[PDB]
Symmetry: D3
Subunit: 157 residues, 6 copies
């Protein structure tokens, strides 16, 4: 059973670590898939985001970190994945996830969208919120893996 956990992960947070960890306890192999997403002008390049997520998930033996520029549904089919993992946060996210899931069901009917709920600890966090706090020199050590926190400080320095 293969699952894909896609997103921009700019950068990967403890919220994302929590969701991917939960996914590895349910599925034999989890592909953490990072969207190149040039249109959103990410803070970190695709190569940097992949390296950070690789280092942050190295302790999980059944996680594979990959980058993609393809249509989500085509990438999932090409990874032989039948499960798509997304974390639920707020109503805006939930409504957007429902749009993506109905669209993905039209593109790949056998790809099942599965929603996980992160720990209360990471419910309110996002990569954007952590970057905004960090841009104004606020302490974000609690919200990120060690390697990511160092890379974020270095990027803003």
């Amino acid at each position: 059973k293969r699952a894909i956990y896609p997103g921009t992960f700019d950068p990967i947070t403890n919220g994302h670590i929590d969701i991917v960890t939960r996914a590895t306890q349910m599925f034999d192999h989890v592909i953490l898939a990072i969207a190149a997403s040039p249109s959103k002008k990410p803070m970190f390049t695709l190569e940097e985001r992949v390296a950070l997520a690789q280092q942050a998930t190295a302790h999980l033996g059944n996680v594979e970190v990959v980058g993609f520029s393809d249509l989500m549904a085509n990438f999932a089919r090409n990874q032989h994945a039948t499960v798509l993992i997304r974390g639920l946060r707020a109503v805006a996210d939930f409504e957007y996830e429902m749009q993506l899931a109905h669209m993905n069901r039209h593109l790949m009917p056998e790809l099942e969208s599965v929603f996980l709920m992160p720990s209360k600890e990471w419910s309110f966090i996002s990569s954007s919120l952590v970057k905004e706090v960090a841009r104004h020199q606020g302490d974000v050590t609690h919200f990120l893996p060690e390697n990511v926190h160092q890379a974020l400080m270095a990027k803003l320095a």
Copy 2:
């Protein structure tokens, strides 16, 4: 991994929305327990025996579904059944809010039970057993939203 998943609810009666969710669950987990609550807060339209018999007949074509009644705390029953995945459907915002509140409570009760939310077909996202019962009680056509055996049982129930 040989995963055991639980899909709990009152299923009063089981609808095509429930069939959709349980079918999706059987496609990703080895064994699915469709768990029927014995004693809901409000008296159900269908007795537990009727709910269990309707759900069994409506899921008989799914080889890895087991329909079982339960009266314990859902998490206590899931633990006893060795289920490590809890399945719930999410139709709209109202569901999202309530299901998130239940998921945090269940994680406190049974941390090893993972809550997994699936989304039903657009065809069933606006239906619930309550809405179907209300429409049928008030003389509206609900045939499209139910398995045939449930449509037959509901007509018989409303006729008396």
Copy 3:
């Protein structure tokens, strides 16, 4: 086009929020049926006869409003009345969710009945008949939210 619109509900009692919606509906459709549900799920504070009489007096200044009681499925009554437009007010998110679920059900029941959502004045967006009744029962001033005849009937009802 000579459109017939239906504005259904329990109207227990009719409030200034309902007056606002029905007034807007009369400005866009030739004939509006303000349809009162005979037998709601919970016993209403006002009997059907009181609800109909209050609604008639409160809308008497609107020439193209007809107040009528109904006990059938709302869509069955709309079809029988030759109404092709169903009017509902949308106050907040809770309304939006429930009304969308009802609209999909009604489209299945009567595809030729179009659901049209109107938004009340900011003055009435936070009120409901239930909230007005709860405030008045607990000795709060609700005069501003009701037509004069309803204010009189509610005071008489609570006095006994």
Copy 4:
């Protein structure tokens, strides 16, 4: 009875066709009004969006497609429209529509905002979602009128 159905329609989808069709069954004349909206940098020019919507609604005899750069409420008054049609989709849209409706009621009290619900078939779709799928080469033929699907493929080619 004249109704106006405004929006950016960049490009017009089957969701928009469904709403305008429902509007023509209720009102004698429907103006489908396209906002020039240069600030949002549309994919299609105003002239292209008007031509696409004209072709896609040609089978509906009581639809008139026009472009506008004016304040919505002023344009509606100048079209002798007393009804404003909007389709409801998600909570974010509904909350935004409520803000526009209260603002429009202050600018033109006699302009009644009317909300329609699209078919379940088009509930999750938007022009942005269709463009995003198409930008990554996903099949969007189901979601658009034929002429629009050809114009979108051509624009991205």
Copy 5:
């Protein structure tokens, strides 16, 4: 400014979520009235005397909290108590919608009473007295969500 704030509710029973909110309120206002509704719509699990005694013992460490029962309209009681601040907790969207509707009503009833919304710790955002009671009734562990005296009273109540 010597502000008097009111924190009203049914508190059936008082939870750690309520303790969190009242503690935050005591940190910003000179005096806080934790106001307990005498006669809720549905019969409470705990009598008013039990709710008041539990709330008093659970807030005894807060020097500027006064626990009082009330049966009037909340705004009428707040006016009589010279409270100018009304405290309510906001956990999620469902709360936000209902609390906004209540706040507009209270502003109409008592314009000089300002509604102030506080947000509880992440630890209690998914809990309510109703959810705690439902979990405990169905044999689930709720010790973490309650003050010790409430945990003791709830176990005694469910045992009989």
Copy 6:
């Protein structure tokens, strides 16, 4: 008791005047704090926004208008404020406010986030909505203090 009311206030509206007035009836001293926010490309410079808010709140004796580029929580600590005022509007805002409040509680546990509800009169308005109406020449005199309405007309002229 000192409270801080932060935001971008680009420009300050009657919705903001209503919230700050309510705040001054509850707290001895209210700091209305304007975020420099260059990343959002505000219509008005920080100096213009501060001058407008100063003039619009001059009739309230216990309001101090200041600009800031710092992390919110650090600015509040440095102002000796223990209360943070935010107005509630829509679900999107409420969900975003909950994220900020949990983040601020991690950065400054003693800073209590307090939410006020504006008058029904200003519930649907925002600085963005007023600017959008004004950009298309719609009458926004009802929604802004006199000095702000003049400055907005002048800026767009």
